[PDB]
């Protein structure tokens, strides 16, 4: 248990950086990033 919680973090955070990646390449669909992030987080 103590060793699998950290696995989900590396697994779930990897998919989220994929969602924020594709949701950025667009011409709404651009204001979603301002709904996912507010603090400048996920800036990588």
């Amino acid at each position: 248990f103590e060793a699998t919680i950290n696995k989900f973090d590396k697994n779930f955070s990897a998919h989220l950086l994929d969602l924020l990646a594709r949701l950025s390449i667009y011409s709404g669909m651009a204001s979603v990033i301002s709904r996912l992030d507010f603090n400048g987080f996920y800036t990588e």
């Binding site: 950025s24 390449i25 667009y26 651009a30």
Partner: protein, 110 residues
Amino acid sequence: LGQGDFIRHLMDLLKPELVRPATTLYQHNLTGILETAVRATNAQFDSPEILRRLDVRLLEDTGWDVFSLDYHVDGPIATVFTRECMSHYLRVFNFLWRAKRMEYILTDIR
């Protein structure tokens, strides 16, 4: 650049961005900055229709070499501009953009 009040604020917000090389520049980020300028300056009190067409385009270095506004126009009004006035305004907008950053540099030194 006939507004002056709006382009002043717009040159203060693009300063932290355009200093980076063009490879790290993506259009989807600048629109939030442009939208912020139109809200803060006096350009907010304006017809919503004409504000729907004013956007950004990325010419294809440094961020001060690929940024320019477009103001695309389609429909019946597009018979007055005819894709050549829009290929001439951008030919002008560069000379008014350079002669505007060469001045805000010289008022920063001062």
